[PDB]
Structure formats: structure tokens, C-alpha cells
Amino acid sequence: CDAFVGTWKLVSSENFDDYMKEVGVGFATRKVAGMAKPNMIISVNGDVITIKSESTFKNTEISFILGQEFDEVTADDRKVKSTITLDGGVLVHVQKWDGKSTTIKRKREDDKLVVECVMKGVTSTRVYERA
Ligand SMILES: O=C(O)Cc1ccc(N2CCCCC2)c(-c2ccccc2)c1
């Protein structure tokens, strides 16, 4: 994951409110979470990848090994079971909870890190730049 490592800042978002609605996030959390401009900090130590999200809304952190499921409390307080893999150079993060599923893909495109969040037919695209 060398080209993912570093400190990234959110610079654009599209369709995120609709993605959060599809996920089941309530009104007040959507409003405050949608305002956030997180920094995403990605690091690797051996086989362990750590992704931190720091913002005025919440500070979260996950550490994981590719292909190995882990339990995650999301920023909107879902208790999910997550599995992250590398598929053709894209980090693919699947979250399962309550019979539901959402997929978050992270990829390098030019000097950006593009984050695509999909729930059923709804996609949100979040673009990060190096900090
Ligand atoms: O990291 C990304 O930008 C993609 C992504 C996906 C889900 C997010 N959650 C879970 C869905 C409800 C809102 C919070 C967030 C998020 C994290 C920190 C502050 C605001 C938003 C970011």
C-alpha cells in the first residue's frame, strides 16, 4: 500500500448525504458528519495497515490485516464486521451489520486518493489531497 501511506485532507464530496440516508444515518448525525473535513492518515507496519480519520465530528482508527475480518464501530455508531482486501490496487472495505452491507473503495488517481462509498444503488465520491 505504499502509494496510500501518508496524511490526506478531504477536498470534495458528492452525494454523501444520500449515501448516509441509504445507510440509515439519522438527521442530526448526517448534518454534523456532512460538515466535517476529515484528515485520513494511513500507515503500514509489517502486515498491519492503520487508517485514522480525524475531524471535528469524530476521531476514528482501524488497524487490520488484509483479508482478515475485524469488528469496527463506525463514526455513526454502527457495530459492523469489516473485511478489507486489495483488488487490483484498490482497497475494498466491506462492512456488514443487521443483514445490510456497504462497500468503501479507496484508490489512488493522479495525486488524489478517491474514496467511493456505495450502499445499494447510491454512490458517494469523496476526494482527498495530500495534506
Ligand atoms: O472517510 C470517508 O471520507 C468516507 C466515509 C464513509 C463513512 C463515514 N461515516 C459513516 C457513515 C456516516 C457518517 C460517518 C465517513 C465519515 C468519517 C468522519 C467524519 C465524517 C464522515 C467517511
UniProtKB/Swiss-Prot annotation:
Which residues are connected by disulfide bridges in this protein?
none
Record localization: Cytoplasm; Nucleus
Q: Which residues carry this modification: N-acetylcysteine?
A: 1
Cited SUPFAM superfamilies: Lipocalins
Q: Which UniProt keywords apply?
A: Acetylation, Cytoplasm, Lipid-binding, Nucleus, Phosphoprotein, Transport
Against CDD domains, the record matches this protein to: FABP4 (cd19467)
Q: Which GO terms describe its biological process?
A: brown fat cell differentiation; cellular response to lithium ion; cellular response to tumor necrosis factor; cholesterol homeostasis; fatty acid transport; long-chain fatty acid transport; negative regulation of DNA-templated transcription; positive regulation of cold-induced thermogenesis
Q: Where does a fatty acid bind?
A: 126-128
UniProt-listed Gene3D superfamilies: 2.40.128.20
Please state the protein's primary subcellular location.
cytoplasm
Entry superkingdom: Eukaryota
Q: What residue intervals hold the motif Nuclear localization signal? A: 21-31
Q: Please give one Gene Ontology molecular function term for this protein.
A: fatty acid binding
Under Pfam families, the record lists: Lipocalin
Residues where Phosphotyrosine occurs?
Answer: 19
Q: Which GO terms describe its cellular component?
A: cytoplasm; cytosol; extracellular exosome; lipid droplet; nucleus
According to the UniProt record, list the residues that bear Phosphoserine: 12
Keyword Acetylation carried by entry? yes
- What is recorded about the domains? Forms a beta-barrel structure that accommodates hydrophobic ligands in its interior.
Task: Report the sequence similarity comment from the record.
Answer: Belongs to the calycin superfamily. Fatty-acid binding protein (FABP) family.
Functionally, this protein is described as follows: Lipid transport protein in adipocytes. Binds both long chain fatty acids and retinoic acid. Delivers long-chain fatty acids and retinoic acid to their cognate receptors in the nucleus.
Q: How does it assemble?
A: Monomer. Homodimer. Interacts with PPARG.
Q: What is this protein called?
A: Fatty acid-binding protein, adipocyte
**Species name:** Homo sapiens (Human)
> What gene name is listed for this protein?
FABP4
